[PDB]
Amino acid sequence: VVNQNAQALNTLVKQLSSNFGAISSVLNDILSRLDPPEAEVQIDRLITGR
Amino acid sequence: NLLLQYGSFCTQLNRALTGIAVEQDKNTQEVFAQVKQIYKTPPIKDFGGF
């Protein structure tokens, strides 16, 4: 039970580094590199994946 | 190539299926293997009329 809880938590933490079809996993890079009125199409997919 | 960027959902799915499939043998063992020796009925059938 301890091991399965720990590995589930570790998988949940490590899932934050995925791309989910966006340009990058880093939120700051997406919001800085791209123009603000067109970055929503990149933010939304990452939000849905998380 | 497009699937490998989504993370490790499929690893979790395979782990769940393996955990489901492995417990059927445990259920069968804990239900039917309660005996320690293979007892054999005697060739005679004098059970008092039963």
Instruction: Write down the experimental method used for this entry.
Output: cryo-EM
Count, residues in chain B: 50
CA atoms within 13 A on the CB side of B39: 5
Q: Round to whole Å and give the CA distance between B36 and A39.
A: 68
Resolution (A): 3.0
Measure the CA angle with vertex B12, ends A8 and A50; round to 5°. Answer: 70
DSSP state of B47: S
Residue by residue, DSSP assigns A21-41 as: TSS-S-HHHHHHHS-GGGSHH
Closest Cα in chain B, distance from residue A6 (Å): 14
Residues 6+ apart with CB under 8 A from A25: A16, A17, A18, A19, A46
Provide the token pair at A17: 């580094």
Which residues of chain B have a CB within 8 Å of the CB of A6? none
Interface of A with B in 20-49 (CB under 8 A): 20-21, 49
C-beta neighbour count of A46 within 10 angstroms: 19
Placement of tokens 């054999």 in the chain: B40
